[PDB]
Design a protein around this ligand. Structure first.
Ligand code: ZN
Ligand code: ZN
Ligand code: ZN
Ligand code: ZN
Lengths: 627, 627
């Protein structure tokens, strides 16, 4: 049947096992998340200018009860409660945070004349709504300075809810980031990334006991326009000691951790340590299951130890861009140490195992945390997991292949499935014996093999539903947010199928010219390029950039700071205008007649180049072979 | 049984099918490889100071008749002959390389008063044996200058074969390398790598039609001591223009291509362009099979184009650190162009398909090169392959997890395998069907499925012998040198089982202290460190260095530039001696009595720490679960 089935007796047995292993008697965080609450709006409904709902908490009311339900891992349900403690907070003297308005927190520091604001949330609507609370409770003041902790959409995404661009250009507002920021915010596997993000965040899922419950570092993500205002000042080297509105500020770049650009903030007046997303109320991801580049556990662990050693020693509160503060120099030194040696263990021991021959596809089943790290709530794998970080690590050092030539050149799962089912007595006998495995709770095994049958015959109703039940039974058990979301999302589309009938200005403007052409490079229908050849000098004089375009062997090349004598067209167009072109906010025909788009040589060639460009459908099949 | 089997009907149909796919008619490389030949010595026999053979070519005699064999892919056979074209060569005026003294080429350039040497092969014996031949053939000259094209050992490792410390330190010999060479030269999965490397290079195989025929960038790899001297000057920035003993050199750095530190070299006076390992006679690795970090196809494509646009236009000969030179600006331009568009198409088209939802499991079965690139020998996947570079590329952007929560949390292959065999009736009905499939040629199917049973029942001789039979046919088929070797090394361990048979001073000397201790942390047995906690101030007075060592929650941390007044112990020891300690040249005890190892605080802690350092077996089980 197509609906969410109650937890099975094993799934419950699993939840009972969690009670037995995790120190639930430690309830301190509940006090730490309550501390300093200034205002908690009775209800929260934040609306984008479109009329759409960015952000909403009432779909999580069923959590407010605090009662058990057994289709939720009880450790995860605990984090889901603590992430529902939203509103305005004092962290320390003149430093404040609004939590539970979005995935991340926005943080307000008092200066002599007005707010220094750290990060800005995902979208303008929630940023705005958050600063309005700061204006209602603490009294209205202007935003002189906005600091990006690190280069994620979670933190620069609502900057247009707070300030608007002429304040920046005029300089009523400054905007600060670590060196690396603009390069790091910016694409090339974005369609793939955003589709597998629907899984990881469970975006089709309803909010509920069988659906979405929590996203580890927050409830979830706000939806709406993404914005992006460039920094006017960058922190270089190892950091800077700056004064902003008369408040002293220490930046400590940790490049190449949870982001390529990132920095911790040390506030010596309040003895406050704002640790970016380096350290939060969860084991962070080394590899997001969304799809990404692997992250350096080792430099991660090493930068937390540098923070322990320069600031952790003399700190009084430690707070972050997600989750909540911990006060007390003793709790601060311990947590930092434990987090330091979390990313260290994951790293050191994963590779220690790999130096004993344990592959990328075994290491997750062998690595376990020592008690002193497993028994911490801030060390649970809510966002990242022990399992998939150790592979991520393994994958960082040795790549995807396990050393075994049996798997050096595999057949696609759809083309391999048919013979798997034929060897196993066919579907009806594959299933029959699968149910027997289902009926004793080997949900990790049933998902692997029934998967084969769904790929061999994706119209087989029976294959999908059983696979779904194994997947949903597996999700109810999940401690990690992304896992739970991911699993249940699969079950959703096996039961119903996928949707059938289905830009940022700031982002495309943020995107480097060279990289646009690199993004453009990904466009190319090779079928259309086959046999083709052209070269085109592009010049964009607003930013003083000249590029050589060269298509040949079904590949678009681009090279900054060179032109050719032999190029068959010269195009001359401001980058500003070229974005409007790709954003369709002007017509090219309108640009050329305006004398904004200039041409010499063959005028067709640029048009030909863009004619050969395919597109990418958002709803591609993940759980079945292509429809 | 235990011996190698003939090519099957389906193996040599496959060998045939290459027949028409590939232009055996262009044999123009053969004149390319023959040209400039000054001497191919009678036979090649290079020994180390050991008495053992570094290098020898007489085991490749079977190819010298040059008759095709169906146990070899005819394209690899073409390369394998081409790489037999060893000896001393002229490339241009006053430019010579010896080829076929090691995996790479060594390059001698005439100066006003001596040689400029570019690269050093793998080990001191071969580089000295090269240098002697050059000295016999066209006169003894000193090497005043040695240049490292890049940071792989097959190019620096033979430097002590040509020079040694006092001529460098007197300044009679300078050493040029690209900035960042030393960190690039030097660990953390050093053991895993190497053992998966025996399979890549097929160190266990015989040289024969039924073993190791070639290694794509050359014959194979010489065996010997690994040396390394430090540079005296570095090329920084985008590059630099020097005059060495009257000869004008231009250096174009290409960092983060085949090596993190690399440079192409341009010689204007002969119009000669030495293209490092950016451009050689083969599709190179993006992802080495032994296990390493994914490399950046895109930067690689672009640096070739950049070189195309600075030099290629005006080059007359283009030679490289592997394989053979090519003459004619028209050819030289063309080759470059194709190579540029090769890695770029690889990068773009993987990302294109990925953006349409083609996962890490399908992509290599989707992507194909277009003819222009396919039908050039130098674009053949001998070293790297289109099939594993795509997956690497997909892997660099999205990671190892293909998106399907059926694979999110797999059971190890040896805990699921059993049911995979019970699912297929039993080791009876798996072998029955599997030998049926073997008769129809389905070798990529069979190596997958039987590996289920070899993992389920790692003693079953019929599973082991069949798996081996299917893997060998695949190895004969394979166009790739690593692939072939891996397939035919797997076969060899399945049949005979894995040996039960049972370090470079310069290498450790060049290893940063932090990095040395990062690796020691990896050696830490997690069981012996549980619950303990110690902190050590390490001082290394020779190099001015100070480290804080901290073990806690089962993790070894190390921190440069820090000292704690609460450390339980302070150990004071020249890095040079800590080297010697780790190279077992000298004992801990003797260093105490020579006043070379001093202590204060708790004198025992350093010993306790080292006591908790475990060890690794080299010969770990790859083709079966851990014995
Ligand atoms: Zn982030
Ligand atoms: Zn965030
Ligand atoms: Zn190399
Ligand atoms: Zn090499």
């Amino acid at each position: 049947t197509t609906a969410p089935k109650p937890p099975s007796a094993f799934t419950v047995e699993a939840q009972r096992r969690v009670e037995a292993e995790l120190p639930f008697a430690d309830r301190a965080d509940f006090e730490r998340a309550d501390r300093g609450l200034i205002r908690r709006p009775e209800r929260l409904l934040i609306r984008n200018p479109d009329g759409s709902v960015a952000w909403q908490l009432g779909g999580y009311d069923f959590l407010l009860d605090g009662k058990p339900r057994d289709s939720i891992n009880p450790s995860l349900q605990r984090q889901a409660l603590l992430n529902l403690k939203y509103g305005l907070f004092e962290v320390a003297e003149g430093i404040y945070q609004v939590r539970g308005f979005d995935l991340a927190n926005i943080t307000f520091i008092r200066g002599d004349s007005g707010w220094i604001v750290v990060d800005t949330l995902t979208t303008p609507a929630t940023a705005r709504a958050a600063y309005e609370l700061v204006s209602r409770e603490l009294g209205e003041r202007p935003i002189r300075t906005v600091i990006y902790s690190h280069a994620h959409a979670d933190h620069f995404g609502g900057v247009r809810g707070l300030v608007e661009p002429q304040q920046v250009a005029s300089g009523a507002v400054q905007i600060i980031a670590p060196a690396g920021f603009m390069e790091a915010a910016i694409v090339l596997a974005g369609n793939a990334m955003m589709r597998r993000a629907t899984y990881q965040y469970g975006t089709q899922l309803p909010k509920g006991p069988q659906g979405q419950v929590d996203m580890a570092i927050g409830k979830g993500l706000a939806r709406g326009p993404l914005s992006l205002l460039a920094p006017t000042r960058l922190i270089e080297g190892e950091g800077e000691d700056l004064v902003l509105d008369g408040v002293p500020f220490t930046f400590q770049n940790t490049p190449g951790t949870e982001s390529p650009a990132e920095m911790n903030i040390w506030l010596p007046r309040q003895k406050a340590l704002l640790m970016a997303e380096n350290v939060v109320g969860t084991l962070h991801n080394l590899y997001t299951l969304r799809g990404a580049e692997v992250r350096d556990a080792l430099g991660w662990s090493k930068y937390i130890n540098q923070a322990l050693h320069r600031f952790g020693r003399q700190a009084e509160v430690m707070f972050a861009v997600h989750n909540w503060p911990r006060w007390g120099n003793a709790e601060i030194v311990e947590v930092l140490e434990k987090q330091r040696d979390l990313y260290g263990y994951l790293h050191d021991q994963t590779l220690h195992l790999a130096n004993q021959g344990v592959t990328i596809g075994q290491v997750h089943n062998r690595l376990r945390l020592p008690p002193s790290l497993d028994q911490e709530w801030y060390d649970r794998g809510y966002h990242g997991s022990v399992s998939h970080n150790a592979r991520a690590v393994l994958n960082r050092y040795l790549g995807y292949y396990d050393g075994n030539p049996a798997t050096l050149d595999p057949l696609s799962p759809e083309d391999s499935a048919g013979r798997y089912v034929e060897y196993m007595g066919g579907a009806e006998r594959l299933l029959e014996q699968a149910r027997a495995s289902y009926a004793r709770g080997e949900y990790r095994w049933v998902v692997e093999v029934v998967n084969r049958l769904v790929f061999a015959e994706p119209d087989n109703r029976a294959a999908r539903e059983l696979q779904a039940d194994a997947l949903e039974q597996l999700g109810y058990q999940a401690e990690n947010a992304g896992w739970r979301n991911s699993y249940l999302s699969a079950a959703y589309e096996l039961r119903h199928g996928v949707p059938r009938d289905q830009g940022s200005a700031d982002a495309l403007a943020a995107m480097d010219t060279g990289l646009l052409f690199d993004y453009l490079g990904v466009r190319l229908d090779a079928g259309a390029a086959e046999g083709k050849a052209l070269s085109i000098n592009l010049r964009l004089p607003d930013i003083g950039e000249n590029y050589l375009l060269e298509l040949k062997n079904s590949h678009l090349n681009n090279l900054r700071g060179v032109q050719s004598e032999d190029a068959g067209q010269t195009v001359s167009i401001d980058r500003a205008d070229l974005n409007r072109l790709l954003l369709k906010e002007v017509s090219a025909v309108r640009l050329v007649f305006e004398g904004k788009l200039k041409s010499s040589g063959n005028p067709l060639l640029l048009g030909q180049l863009f004619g050969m460009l395919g597109d990418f459908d958002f709803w591609f099949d993940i759980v079945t072979p292509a429809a």
